[PDB]
Amino acid sequence: KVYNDGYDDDNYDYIVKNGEKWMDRYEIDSLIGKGSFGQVVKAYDRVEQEWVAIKIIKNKKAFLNQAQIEVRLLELMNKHDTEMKYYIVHLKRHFMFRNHLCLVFEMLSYNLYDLLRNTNFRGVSLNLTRKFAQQMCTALLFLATPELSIIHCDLKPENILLCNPKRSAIKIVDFGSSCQLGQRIYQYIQSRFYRSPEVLLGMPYDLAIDMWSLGCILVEMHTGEPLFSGANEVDQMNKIVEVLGIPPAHILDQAPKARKFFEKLPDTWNLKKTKKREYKPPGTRKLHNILGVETGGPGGRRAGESGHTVADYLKFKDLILRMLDYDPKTRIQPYYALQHSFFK
Ligand SMILES: C[C@@H]1O[C@@H](OC[C@H]2O[C@@H](Oc3c(-c4ccc(O)c(O)c4)oc4cc(O)cc(O)c4c3=O)[C@H](O)[C@@H](O)[C@@H]2O)[C@H](O)[C@H](O)[C@H]1O
Secondary structure, X not given: OOOHHHOEXXXXXXXXXOOOEEOOOEEEEEEEEEOOOEEEEEEEEOOOOEXXXXXXXXXXXXXXXXXXXXXXXXXXXXXXXXXXXXXXXXXXXXXXXXXXXXXXXXXXXXXXXXXXXXXXXXXXXXXXXXXXXXXXXXXXXXXXXXXXXXXXOOOOHHHEEEOOOOOXXXXXXXXXXXXXXXXXXXXXXXXXXXXXXXXXXXXXXXXXXHHHHXXXXXXXHHHOOOOOOOOOHHHHHHHHHHHXXXXXXXXXXXXXXXXXXXXXXXXXXXXXXXXXOOOOOOOOOOHHHHOOOOOOOHHHOOOOOOOOOHHHHHHHHHHHHHHOOOOOOXXXXXXXXXXXXXXX
């Protein structure tokens, strides 16, 4: 029938007309994509003479309310990144249009998944991975600023955009799930391949969840493939234990959902019983071999390549293991990740 005077559809989304003009300023160009929040469109800002992406939030109070929480987090980040030096796509503007909240951002055309797919999932060089890693840690250092204390909650290759597909500069998007430390609201957060063990275990979480995601992402960037590609939460936890072993007892003893994955023995914790191909035993799928530390890197493609010496790979493996620490209190933090020897 009639939704929002004919401007909306049955799913509370604005019906995008390729070419429409808004407020004598924005010329809608095309739909970029859809999400649970609403839609993203490409548009030309005629006043500032530049391409933008506009997040059109659903015309429904629950989604309006989450987006208003995010506008407040974005404005707070603007109050502390005047120089736009940290690698975040900042909010340019917010306004209401025909009962939709709209968020304006700089338009970037390619994300990190696009780069991987272009290499046919062979992975980017360790030198490029090093540069991306340095920028991501800087962005996380910025979010860890005391006044901010923002948890991103959805770091994944698709949410890291390329400033120019041949440049090394990146910028983070999508604070739709983010929250400040203390104001946590949701339990089912993070993309599954990049979901930290504390979220899988239903424990309280903090900014360390973003550093876990970063470790997974960096490994995928250089190998071409997701490190932990679980199809559901039990499969995700087991793939993590394949590489990292059983989580420390002092974590599982306080983990609300420890018994979804593990069994406490009369002695200690072990995995739950299976019926019949057992996953590789805990800790036996070594990062050392996933990265090909001594065999010319992933697929052996990096033999004799500068920046891919055995020493470089051992430094990279060491940083990744600090990022994939089961303990969110001892998991490496952004400032100290930046002083790691992987970055010289
Ligand atoms: C490069 C883009 O990558 C992917 O989108 C990236 C992410 O964009 C987010 O869209 C957003 C973009 C964004 C900025 C520039 C763009 O050119 C663009 O298309 C989108 O920037 C933000 C910046 C913030 O500070 C906070 C945010 O919440 C967002 C945001 O949600 C979506 O919410 C996510 O669902 C999506 O994953 C898609 O493949 C898309 O089609 C493609 O164009």
